[PDB]
Design a protein around this ligand. Structure first.
Ligand SMILES: [Zn+2]
Length: 387
């Protein structure tokens, strides 16, 4: 009887035995990019973390349906487009292209589905209509459509918080009117645009059905974003939204919060000029995905020397229970610290076989090591190229 995977569920604050709704299948939605600018290393970490999650789940034999959305309806896109004097539609398209190039450069898996908000407006309107019909939504002195949070008594359960033209300050917009000159869509409530959260509620359930297995994103999306998705989807469809919630830890820069106001944001493209993708991945995945991580020259260099050590052991070679122990590490909520230390144990034994001139055994062990490392997107270079 094969060992189960256990994953931390943000909803419950605990590691739970992972149990797919349909046997052997995993439906996964991950919040994606707002396409008004280059993705930064913060996003980079989330992208890499969930790349590892999908790769590992497929490794264990799960059939994974992987969905990641593009947020191409947002005020930042409107704001940014205006500054650059271009149309919002042109800015969005431009940075969707940039996004695909950066993702390719990071060597992440492409999602099976990449829904854009611009193509799911009817689905959003349907959900909003249900919320109005259920009386969880309302207009709206100024014409906007809002969600009535005091009605949803489970509100705040994801983040475990109690009380922290709107009837109530906590209420959030579902459909906002468009300002003159702004892009807009027609609806029964006037020309305007969907709020941010209702976009992901509508796209995810429309594509994956409801409920689905796993919903992911950066920890900063937990509230209000994911919290609001739950309220919308469970009040709106009157059934459970998501079985398990995964949140990727925060990324600091030299121990300081990544902040637009501090001007310390580092784009993925800038990071890839300084480091190789495998060096970036080593740094991003060596710590536990839920813990904060600090981007710095020292921490990158450390991963670079770690990798150097890797490729030296593989260098000249021709092209097990370690696999089992690898599963046991990853099965414990993707415990990469234990998994990485296991890969280094494999390197030590590889070097042993090499020094003792047992080259066959070294080569076979290297094959397995390279296979397991693939899940982290590491050890795929030709050793000579890297060195
Ligand atoms: Zn989202």
């Amino acid at each position: 009887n094969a060992m189960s995977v256990k994953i931390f569920n943000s909803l419950t604050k605990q590691k739970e035995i992972f149990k797919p709704i349909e046997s052997g299948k995993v439906k996964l939605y991950v919040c994606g990019m707002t396409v008004y600018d280059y993705m930064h290393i913060g996003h980079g970490r989330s992208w890499i973390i969930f790349d590892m999650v999908v790769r590992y789940l497929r490794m264990r034999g799960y059939e994974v349906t992987f969905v990641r959305n593009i947020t191409d309806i947002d005020d930042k896109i409107i704001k940014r487009a205006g500054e650059n004097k271009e149309s919002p539609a042109a800015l969005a398209e431009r940075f969707i292209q940039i996004l695909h190039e950066d993702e390719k450069a990071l060597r992440v898996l492409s999602p099976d589905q990449e829904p854009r908000a611009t193509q799911y407006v009817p689905e959003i309107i349907k959900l909003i209509q249900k919320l109005l019909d259920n009386q969880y939504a309302y207009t709206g002195q100024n014409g906007d459509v809002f969600f009535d949070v005091r009605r949803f008594k489970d509100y705040g359960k994801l983040s475990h918080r109690h009380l922290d033209s709107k009837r109530d300050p906590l209420d959030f917009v579902l459909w906002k009117k468009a300002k003159p000159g702004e892009p807009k869509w027609d609806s029964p409530w006037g020309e305007g645009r969907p709020g941010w959260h209702i976009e992901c509620s509508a796209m995810s359930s429309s594509i994956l059905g409801q409920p689905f297995d796993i919903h992911g994103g950066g920890l900063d999306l937990k509230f209000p974003h994911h919290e609001n998705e739950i309220a919308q989807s469970e009040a709106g469809e009157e059934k459970p939204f998501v079985k398990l919630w995964m949140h990727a830890g925060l990324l600091e820069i030299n121990k300081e919060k990544m902040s637009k106001s501090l001007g310390n944001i580092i784009s993925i493209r800038e990071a890839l000029k300084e480091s190789d993708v495998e060096v970036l991945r080593y740094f991003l995945l060596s710590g536990h995905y839920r813990n904060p991580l600090s981007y710095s020259k020292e921490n990158l260099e450390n991963g670079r020397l770690a990798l150097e050590r890797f490729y030296l052991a593989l260098r000249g070679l021709p092209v097990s229970s370690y696999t089992d122990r690898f599963y046991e590490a990853m099965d414990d909520d993707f415990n990469t610290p234990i998994a990485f230390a296991l890969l280094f144990e494999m390197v030590r034994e590889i070097n042993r076989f090499r020094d003792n001139n047992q080259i066959e055994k070294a080569a076979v062990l290297a094959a397995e090591l390279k296979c397991l490392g693939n899940i982290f997107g590491l050890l795929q270079y030709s050793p000579e190229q890297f060195l």
